[PDB]
Design an enzyme around this catalytic site. Sequence first.
Site, PDB file in Angstrom:
ATOM      1  CB  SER A  32     -30.112  38.672 -16.186  1.00 28.73           C
ATOM      2  OG  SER A  32     -29.742  37.511 -15.452  1.00 28.73           O
ATOM      3  CG  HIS A  63     -36.337  27.546 -15.598  1.00 27.02           C
ATOM      4  ND1 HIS A  63     -35.736  28.585 -14.912  1.00 27.02           N
ATOM      5  CD2 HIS A  63     -36.532  26.565 -14.681  1.00 27.02           C
ATOM      6  CE1 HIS A  63     -35.584  28.252 -13.643  1.00 27.02           C
ATOM      7  NE2 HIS A  63     -36.056  27.030 -13.477  1.00 27.02           N
ATOM      8  CG  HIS A  85     -24.211  34.070 -12.507  1.00 26.49           C
ATOM      9  ND1 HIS A  85     -25.135  33.482 -13.347  1.00 26.49           N
ATOM     10  CD2 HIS A  85     -24.329  35.407 -12.697  1.00 26.49           C
ATOM     11  CE1 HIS A  85     -25.798  34.422 -13.998  1.00 26.49           C
ATOM     12  NE2 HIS A  85     -25.328  35.599 -13.620  1.00 26.49           N
ATOM     13  CE1 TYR A  87     -25.015  35.962  -9.361  1.00 29.19           C
ATOM     14  CE2 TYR A  87     -26.428  34.061  -9.031  1.00 29.19           C
ATOM     15  CZ  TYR A  87     -26.115  35.206  -9.721  1.00 29.19           C
ATOM     16  OH  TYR A  87     -26.901  35.604 -10.786  1.00 29.19           O
ATOM     17  CD  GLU A  88     -26.119  30.148 -11.302  1.00 25.99           C
ATOM     18  OE1 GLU A  88     -27.063  29.385 -11.592  1.00 25.99           O
ATOM     19  OE2 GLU A  88     -25.380  30.663 -12.158  1.00 25.99           O
ATOM     20  CB  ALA A 115     -28.132  42.810 -15.979  1.00 33.35           C
ATOM     21  CG  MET A 218     -23.273  39.793  -8.807  1.00 35.35           C
ATOM     22  SD  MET A 218     -24.779  39.150  -8.028  1.00 35.35           S
ATOM     23  CE  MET A 218     -25.322  40.666  -7.236  1.00 35.35           C
ATOM     24  CB  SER A 219     -21.441  37.296 -14.570  1.00 36.17           C
ATOM     25  OG  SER A 219     -22.314  38.406 -14.794  1.00 36.17           O
ATOM     26  CG  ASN A 242     -29.904  47.822 -10.251  1.00 33.86           C
ATOM     27  OD1 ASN A 242     -29.987  46.668 -10.658  1.00 33.86           O
ATOM     28  ND2 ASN A 242     -28.913  48.224  -9.462  1.00 33.86           N
ATOM     29  CG  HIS A 256     -33.198  39.308 -10.146  1.00 37.53           C
ATOM     30  ND1 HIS A 256     -32.983  38.719 -11.373  1.00 37.53           N
ATOM     31  CD2 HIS A 256     -34.201  38.601  -9.567  1.00 37.53           C
ATOM     32  CE1 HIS A 256     -33.827  37.714 -11.535  1.00 37.53           C
ATOM     33  NE2 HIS A 256     -34.579  37.623 -10.453  1.00 37.53           N
TER      34      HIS A 256
HETATM   35  O1  LIG Z   1     -26.796  46.810  -8.145  1.00 39.47           O
HETATM   36  C1  LIG Z   1     -26.337  45.743  -8.592  1.00 39.47           C
HETATM   37  N1  LIG Z   1     -25.265  45.123  -7.970  1.00 39.47           N
HETATM   38  C2  LIG Z   1     -24.699  43.956  -8.371  1.00 39.47           C
HETATM   39  N2  LIG Z   1     -25.117  43.244  -9.420  1.00 39.47           N
HETATM   40  C3  LIG Z   1     -26.166  43.827 -10.041  1.00 39.47           C
HETATM   41  C4  LIG Z   1     -26.788  45.015  -9.702  1.00 39.47           C
HETATM   42  N3  LIG Z   1     -27.814  45.307 -10.546  1.00 39.47           N
HETATM   43  C5  LIG Z   1     -27.877  44.295 -11.444  1.00 39.47           C
HETATM   44  N4  LIG Z   1     -26.894  43.412 -11.126  1.00 39.47           N
HETATM   45  C6  LIG Z   1     -26.748  42.116 -11.977  1.00 39.47           C
HETATM   46  O2  LIG Z   1     -28.119  41.591 -12.123  1.00 39.47           O
HETATM   47  C7  LIG Z   1     -28.223  40.140 -11.949  1.00 39.47           C
HETATM   48  C8  LIG Z   1     -29.493  39.899 -11.152  1.00 39.47           C
HETATM   49  O3  LIG Z   1     -30.592  40.432 -11.930  1.00 39.47           O
HETATM   50  C9  LIG Z   1     -26.967  39.633 -11.260  1.00 39.47           C
HETATM   51  O4  LIG Z   1     -26.487  38.380 -11.917  1.00 39.47           O
HETATM   52  C10 LIG Z   1     -25.945  40.866 -11.413  1.00 39.47           C
HETATM   53  O5  LIG Z   1     -24.826  40.516 -12.321  1.00 39.47           O
END
Ligand SMILES: O=c1[nH]cnc2c1ncn2[C@@H]1O[C@H](CO)[C@@H](O)[C@H]1O
EC number: 2.4.2.1
Length: 288
Positions: A32, A63, A85, A87-88, A115, A218-219, A242, A256
């Site tokens: 991302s 998109h 992912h 989660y989808e 990310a 998450m990936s 973050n 996100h």
């Molecule tokens: O604090 C967090 N915890 C878990 N995943 C996060 C975090 N920050 C970013 N992502 C990652 O950002 C994407 C969404 O923008 C998610 O797909 C995840 O892999």
Amino acid sequence: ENGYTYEDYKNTAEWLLSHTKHRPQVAIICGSGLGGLTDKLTQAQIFDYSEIPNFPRSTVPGHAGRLVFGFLNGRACVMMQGRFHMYEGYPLWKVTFPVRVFHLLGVDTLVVTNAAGGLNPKFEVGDIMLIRDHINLPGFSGQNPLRGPNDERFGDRFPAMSDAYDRTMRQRALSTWKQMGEQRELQEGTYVMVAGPSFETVAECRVLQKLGADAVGMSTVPEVIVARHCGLRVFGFSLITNKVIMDYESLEKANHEEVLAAGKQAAQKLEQFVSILMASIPLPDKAS
Ligand SMILES: O=c1[nH]cnc2c1ncn2[C@@H]1O[C@H](CO)[C@@H](O)[C@H]1O
């Protein structure tokens, strides 16, 4: 393995072959905000996942969920703009389908980006963390891409992940970083996969700390795992978007919708960093 037969992968790869004069060597999976690296391809040949035979279509991204071939800094690539992912809803054997195709296409290296949130305090949002190791939380409980019957044509029953993130390329990245002479040093640590679309809670955040994770995402791990099963050289970065809130105050949010980090110069630079490393990915010829 489930859901797809060996020949499912073969038919997709062959179809792809007979549809692009490109024969890739490096597969890059853009996370991302790092989807712009597709802009740096040459002789780019775009395909929608959907046009491609057994390829999982994207759940929302009509998109831009697509696969682009081209050359990047002297490397025959193929990039996934928008990855799959858990989660989808994708069963892990769908999330990783791409990788098994990439192998049959002739790909011998896979660079994966994502990310991630920051658990190690040293991390600064914007930081780019080199992935040295991973903690595969879903895998510990069965959510492992290699579950089911094993195909010795792809790999062994019990592959080792002891060594997934290629050592060599990590030196090369550590240095290429310096070649560029870029102020802040390219970070490096352990990436913990975690599914479920929701973000962590302070307490979960602290368990991930304990576990020894530096970044949470998450990936990536599913893709890294089957890449290894295949014999793909694997290396990847993580764009710290973050700082996960490890205390009961802060408010400095982890997010996100707040992925401006991944929609910032921060992302832009990882894009050229990855472009430079193309020159350091060993050719199939080895050479001299
Ligand atoms: O604090 C967090 N915890 C878990 N995943 C996060 C975090 N920050 C970013 N992502 C990652 O950002 C994407 C969404 O923008 C998610 O797909 C995840 O892999």
